[PDB]
From Swiss-Prot:
Protein name (record): ATP-dependent RNA helicase DDX3X
Effect of mutating S291A: Impairs phosphorylation by TBK1 and fails to synergize with TBK1 in IFN-beta induction
Resulting phenotype, T287A: Impairs phosphorylation by TBK1 and fails to synergize with TBK1 in IFN-beta induction
Gene name, Swiss-Prot/TrEMBL: DDX3X
Helicase C-terminal domain: residues covered: 263-424
Region (Interaction with HCV core protein): 258-424
Disease: Intellectual developmental disorder, X-linked, syndromic, Snijders Blok type: A disorder characterized by mild to severe intellectual disability, hypotonia, movement disorders, behavior problems, corpus callosum hypoplasia, and epilepsy. Additionally, patients manifest variable non-neurologic features such as joint hyperlaxity, skin pigmentary abnormalities, cleft lip and/or palate, hearing and visual impairment, and precocious puberty.
Family label: Belongs to the DEAD box helicase family. DDX3/DED1 subfamily.
Length: 424
């Protein structure tokens, strides 16, 4: 049929969905930015819903982003959160899908295995749900049916949610890979790809999964598909990712991009191995007892030992490791956001692809051997809006990383221990 004409409204539905500065651009032929949602005939379903959704003027991001996207041009955008980046890609993407129609491929087959027209990859359940909920707002009265899947939840209901129809898919990388291997999702006709919060997805170690999804499967190559990345920070691993996934794109930054962090306090202390346990105890005693704490250690043997130690000195802690049985799983995780056990001891490898959310204090009991992993770990601080904290224990075992750590601290505008320079 037709995908520009709105469907009959449902009043049951609207009450559900609808509860009441410099900018830099870098690249060829970047189409001029925009006044108001009115320039570019998005189409009725969009502004129909735009007025429903309280949006009055697009956001600074939404405004350099939405036209670039509508003009079939890849982009790499940097913006702090609360900047309205979600609607920035959802609005124009969905607008196109409404105008162009499902597409001859899908049509030619109109259950079970689904082929999404658009794939949005998100780091966490919380953000994935967020994107999903606004997708519903802007797909209301359309024949586009969005879905969301994520880890740390029953896959059975998700699978069945998929089989009801899925044109726009929001997903955490680990769960999407699970769906593909199960034959539930195919990317053969995916025409729009979005990596929201890319830097964080890399911090949690989703890169192998993301490269499985994009590069190693049936997903249309760049130039054919339209690809968009949104990232707070812009590390080198991220510009390499943009190099590999994007095609002659436009670069956007509203506030100027910090290389990393900006909402984490960073504190390095010299602590001999002999003293780490006592030092940790002091750190924890100063913790706002409700605040969640993540403790990284090097080996599993070390993770079980420390956690054992903490539990007997009477702390509510849990461990995630791999001498551990696989479904103690989220049980450890699930106790973490519960506040039942505000201290989680873990190895970096055992925390790969785990949505360890709302962590206020990250403690590197042991430091990794490269600065890139160090960036990954302190990346587990939670919210944007609220300053987070990263304390690292350092000694002679960590000599190799002084200069990298020193440069990072300087570029992050953090206090530099006066002995650290002397070590380099
Ligand atoms: N043009 C707009 N006018 C008013 N409010 C808006 C506009 N665009 C988005 N918002 C609201 O701003 C809030 C935060 O923006 P959102 O759509 O979540 O993107 P975002 O916050 O930049 N991405 P993230 O920070 O990771 O959550 C939401 O409640 C949106 O409904």
């Amino acid at each position: 049929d037709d995908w520009s004409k709105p469907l009959p409204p449902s009043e049951r539905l609207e009450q559900e969905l609808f509860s009441g500065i410099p900018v830099e651009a870098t690249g060829n032929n970047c189409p001029p930015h925009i006044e108001s949602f009115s320039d570019v005939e998005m189409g009725e379903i969009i502004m129909g819903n735009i007025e429903l959704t309280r949006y009055t003027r697009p956001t600074p991001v939404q405004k350099h982003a939405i036209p670039i996207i509508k003009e079939k041009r890849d982009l790499m955008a940097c913006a702090q959160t609360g900047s309205g980046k979600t609607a920035a890609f959802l609005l124009p993407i969905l607008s196109q899908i409404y105008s162009d129609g499902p597409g001859e491929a899908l049509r030619a087959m109109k259950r079970r295995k689904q082929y999404p027209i658009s794939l949005v990859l998100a780091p966490t359940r919380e953000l994935a749900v967020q994107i999903y909920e606004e997708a519903r707002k802007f797909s209301y009265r359309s024949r586009v049916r969005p879905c969301v899947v994520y880890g740390g939840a029953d896959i059975g209901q998700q699978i069945r949610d998929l089989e009801r129809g899925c044109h726009l898919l929001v997903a955490t990388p680990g769960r999407l890979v699970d769906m593909m291997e199960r034959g539930k999702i195919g990317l053969d006709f995916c025409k729009y790809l979005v990596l929201d919060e890319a830097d964080r997805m890399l911090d949690m170690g989703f890169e192998p999964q993301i490269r499985r999804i994009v590069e190693q499967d049936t997903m249309p190559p760049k130039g054919v598909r339209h690809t968009m990345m949104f990232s707070a920070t812009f590390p080198k691993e991220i510009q390499m990712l943009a190099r590999d996934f994007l095609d002659e794109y436009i670069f956007l930054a509203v506030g100027r991009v910090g290389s990393t962090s900006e909402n984490i306090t960073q504190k390095v202390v010299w602590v001999e191995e002999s003293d780490k346990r006592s030092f940790l105890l002091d750190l924890l005693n100063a913790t706002g007892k409700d605040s969640l704490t993540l403790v990284f250690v090097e080996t599993k043997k070390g993770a079980d030992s420390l956690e054992d130690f903490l539990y007997h000195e009477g702390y509510a802690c849990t461990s995630i490791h791999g001498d551990r049985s696989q479904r103690d799983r989220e049980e450890a995780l699930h106790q973490f956001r519960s506040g039942k056990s505000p201290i989680l001891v873990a190895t970096a490898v055992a925390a790969r692809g785990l949505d360890i959310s709302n962590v206020k204090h990250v403690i590197n009991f042991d430091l990794p051997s490269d600065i890139e992993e160090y960036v990954h770990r302190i990346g587990r601080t939670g919210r944007v809006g609220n300053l987070g904290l990263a304390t690292s224990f350092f000694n002679e075992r960590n000599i190799n990383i002084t200069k990298d750590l020193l440069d990072l601290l300087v570029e992050a505008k953090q206090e530099v221990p006066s002995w650290l320079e002397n070590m380099a």
